Every structure is written in C-alpha cells, then in structure tokens.
C-alpha cells in the first residue's frame, strides 16, 4: 500500500515524484 515506496523500489533508477495521491514516474 506504500505506493511511493513500491514505485521507488520497482523503478530503481527513475525519478518517482510522490505527491500525495499523485505519483509521477519519470524514467
């Protein structure tokens, strides 16, 4: 449920911007 963590762990290298209910993955 920690999507910021999950995304920032899965996308090891990408710029995952966590902003509340918004997540911006910039690879």
Cα-only R_g, the chain: 8
3: its two tokens: 């999507």
Asked if 8 and 18 touch (Cβ cutoff 8 Å), the reply is yes
Backbone angles phi, psi at 3, to 5 degrees: -70, -30
2 Cβ contact partners less than 8 Å away, ≥ 6 residues apart: none
**DSSP per residue over 1-27, as a string?**
--HHHHHHHHTBTBEEEEETTEEEEE-
Torsion over CA: 9, 13, 14, 18 (sign):
positive
Q: How many CA atoms lie within 13 A of 13 on its CB side?
A: 1
Alpha-carbon distance 5 to 8, whole Å? Answer: 5
Q: Are strands 22-26 and 15-19 parallel, antiparallel or unpaired?
A: antiparallel
Experimental method reported for this structure:
NMR
Asked if 4 and 18 touch (Cβ cutoff 8 Å), the reply is yes
């Amino acid at each position: 449920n920690d999507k910021c963590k999950e995304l920032k762990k899965r996308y090891a290298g990408c710029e995952v911007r966590c902003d509340x209910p918004r997540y911006e993955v910039h690879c």
